């Protein structure tokens, strides 16, 4: 089916005037596979997935050199940003960046991304056309000019359409059977009385991969939405994910409520009820 | 033509075991400096890269080589414990925001075992044959630069105090006067062809100039002749109506 | 990583040719063409970024494929003689460093309109009876052979351009530091045009 690769960067300054920390993490769908952390004597890119270990020393050095260079340049960027916003030395701030490529069912690129935030808020983003920028404010417009002068968009576009797609296809093949296998959710409905407003009907979905899922309660064949408690999709720790959705029901009316689950591993939505 | 990158000195001649420093100013507005080395029968090789006063990336630069970028943004490349194989062209480039690298004119280094064999050229100008004038209605002057070591010469033609390029060509490479000898001295020839009329004006003045790069005035000289310093040697000819 | 072919090019004036540059890179940031004259630094010509891109300026045209780049030189002139350098930047490496090929050293052999091959004796201006022999005005196809005699010095052929009157001419110089050295015999080792003019 559809797949993506994403690199997440974090560059954050420390109090006073210490050396800012740069962290890079790489992801194929919901599977972390590399990490680099600049806070060490001799920092190196490290594998976080079995299927990347087979990559030779040259692959690892290329990563490390990119991330070591970024460590230095993202420091200058942090100084640039605290100038734009007239912020003082001490003084803790964060540049966040996410980029990468999405593949459709065919294996062809659907879209590329490059997105930056400053202190948790959208700052600058590469547009869908992979050739223009959307800047949040006048400070981001200064960044945009620098990046237009340096043809950042054109070089990112070349990366996203080639290198990004090429390597994502490699990891998908090398990591197939884990990356290219969709585990369907195991589902059940539990019943917990509470007397006042009667009972809870909780709809579970467990052990599914990837994380993307839809869980909704219907009453008489109608999306409830307003009075349904949705929990955040959470990792089980063994690479699978968990989610539940619960509603409060007037006891002996459980049978008019249905749970609905949509997932990549399910050929069609499951309609579920409470089993007495 | 010239990019805007400034490289000095253009020529260096030195002894083995010595130390030299090369200088580079990037283009105005460029903040980066890249250093490259071009050895004979070999292409350009990346040595080292700076951005805004900071070392950014490193090629196959030897440990005895070192460099810096100053606040000026200008850069110095230092080569120490020099060996014969260090003889090369050293190029610096600055990069534009747009990505392009723009190169300087290079510094050419020649490392010799010692400097006792360094010689400036003698130059002579040979006047056009009456036979050529009579046969073609043109007139060729020949310049000869002889007995120089090492290879570092720039020959130019000066007509009435101005440098000329039309009607001149000079040998692309100098000739080894004693090819079997390793430190053979060199010869170089150049032609300037004018119209017979132009040569037949006694007011027309022709000078062959050979700039020689040799010892750097600070280098020691124990020999009994004159120190073969960087110098220009000239020969000249006046026009002949007759 | 960057391989150029051919090493050296020997073309006639007006004879078109295309210079190859093969490249292998993790991802192409930019492909570059430079011109380097003897004793000069590389001078910028073109940059190409994506497969199918073309750029043209007068007699030079550069194209780009996934695997290589071609510099097409159309109807080249003597002035086009230079070394042509190819270089690439990589998306998998930081900064803007170039990795160069070893270059294509091109010499364009000039057409000679009206060859008037002759050997003249020139005399030093100063002087104390010094002289030189000049083989001049020969056509594009005659070439100057070296002497095995160590006491005779003979240069390669050299083309002078009198731009003022649309006139090029070839020449080579011979001199010897001693003994019966007549200009009549100076270029003896070369194939000499049978029509060469020898003044008496």
């Amino acid at each position: 089916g559809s797949h993506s690769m994403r690199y997440f960067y974090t560059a954050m300054s420390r109090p006073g005037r210490g050396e800012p920390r740069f962290i890079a993490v790489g992801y194929v769908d919901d599977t972390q596979f590399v990490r680099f952390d600049s806070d060490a004597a001799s920092p190196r890119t490290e594998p976080r997935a079995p299927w990347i270990e087979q990559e030779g020393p040259e692959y690892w050095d290329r990563n490390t050199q990119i991330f070591k260079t970024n460590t230095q340049t993202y420091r200058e960027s942090l100084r640039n940003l605290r100038g734009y916003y007239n912020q003082s030395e001490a003084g803790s701030h964060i540049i966040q960046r996410m980029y990468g490529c999405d593949l459709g069912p065919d294996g062809r690129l659907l879209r590329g991304h490059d997105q930056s935030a400053y202190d948790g808020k959208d700052y600058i983003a590469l547009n869908e056309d992979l050739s223009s920028w959307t800047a949040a404010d006048t400070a981001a417009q200064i960044t945009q000019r620098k990046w237009e002068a340096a043809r950042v968009a054109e070089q990112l576009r070349a990366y996203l359409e080639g290198l990004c797609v090429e390597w994502l296809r490699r990891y998908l093949e090398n990591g197939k059977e884990t990356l290219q296998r969709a585990d369907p959710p195991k589902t059940h409905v539990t019943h917990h009385p509470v007397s006042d407003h009667e009972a809870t009907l909780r709809c579970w979905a467990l052990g599914f991969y990837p994380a993307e899922i839809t869980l909704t309660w219907q009453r008489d064949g109608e999306d409830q939405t307003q009075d349904t408690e949705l929990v955040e999709t959470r990792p089980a720790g063994d690479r699978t994910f968990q989610k539940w959705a619960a509603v409060v029901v007037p006891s002996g009316e459980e049978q008019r409520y249905t749970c609905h689950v949509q997932h990549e591993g399910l050929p069609k939505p499951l309609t579920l009820r409470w089993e007495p | 033509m010239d990019s805007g990158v400034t490289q000095t000195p253009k020529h260096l001649i030195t002894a083995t075991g010595q130390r030299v420093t090369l200088r580079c100013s990037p283009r105005s507005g460029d903040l980066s400096v890249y250093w490259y080395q071009q050895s004979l029968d070999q292409g350009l090789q990346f040595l080292i890269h700076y951005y805004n006063g900071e070392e950014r990336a490193k090629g196959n630069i030897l440990e005895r080589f070192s460099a810096q970028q100053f606040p000026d943004l200008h850069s110095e490349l230092n080569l120490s414990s020099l060996e014969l194989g260090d003889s090369a062209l050293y190029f610096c480039a600055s990069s534009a925001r747009s990505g392009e690298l723009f190169f300087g004119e290079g510094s050419r280094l020649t490392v010799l075992e010692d400097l006792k064999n360094v010689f400036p050229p003698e130059v002579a100008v040979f006047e056009p044959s009456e036979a050529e004038i009579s046969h073609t209605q043109k007139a060729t002057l020949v310049c000869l630069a002889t007995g120089f070591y090492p290879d570092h010469v720039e020959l130019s033609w000066w007509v009435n105090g101005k440098e000329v390029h039309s009607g001149v060509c000079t040998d692309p490479q100098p000739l080894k006067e004693q090819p079997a000898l390793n430190d053979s001295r060199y010869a170089l020839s150049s032609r300037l062809r004018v119209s017979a009329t132009f040569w037949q004006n006694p007011r027309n003045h022709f000078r062959c100039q050979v700039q020689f790069y040799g010892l750097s005035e600070n280098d020691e000289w124990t020999q009994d002749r004159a120190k073969p310093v960087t110098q220009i040697v000239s020969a000249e000819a006046w026009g002949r109506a007759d | 990583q960057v391989t150029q072919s051919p090493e050296a090019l020997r073309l006639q004036e007006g004879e078109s040719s295309s210079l190859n540059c093969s490249y292998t890179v993790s991802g192409l940031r930019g492909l570059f063409w430079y011109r380097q004259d003897p004793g000069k630094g590389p001078e910028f010509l073109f940059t190409l970024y994506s497969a199918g891109e073309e750029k043209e300026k007068e007699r030079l045209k550069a194209t780009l494929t996934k695997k290589e780049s071609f510099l097409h030189i159309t109807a080249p002139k003597p002035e086009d003689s230079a070394t042509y350098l190819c270089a690439v930047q990589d998306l998998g490496t930081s900064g803007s460093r170039l990795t160069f090929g070893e270059g294509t050293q091109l010499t364009v052999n000039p057409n000679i309109q009206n060859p008037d091959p002759a050997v003249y004796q020139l005399r030093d201006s100063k002087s104390s009876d010094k002289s030189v022999c000049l083989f001049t005005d020969f056509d594009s196809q005659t070439n100057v052979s070296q002497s095995k005699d160590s006491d005779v010095y003979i240069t390669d052929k050299c083309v002078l351009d009198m731009r003022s009157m649309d006139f090029k001419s070839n020449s080579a110089v011979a001199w010897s530091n001693k003994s019966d050295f007549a200009c009549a015999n100076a270029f003896n080792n070369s194939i000499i045009p049978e029509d060469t003019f020898f003044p008496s």
Binding site: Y7, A24, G26, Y59, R62, N63, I66, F67, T69, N70, T73, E76, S77, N80, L81, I95, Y99, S116, Y123, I124, T143, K146, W147, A149, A150, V152, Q155, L156, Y159, L163, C164, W167 | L31, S32, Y51, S95, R97, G99 | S26, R29, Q89, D90, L91, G92, T93, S94, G95, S96
Partner: peptide, 11 residues
């Protein structure tokens, strides 16, 4: 594989 940032890519 990540992307390499060229010169002058600062914010």
């Amino acid at each position: 594989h990540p992307v390499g940032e060229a010169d002058y890519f600062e914010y």
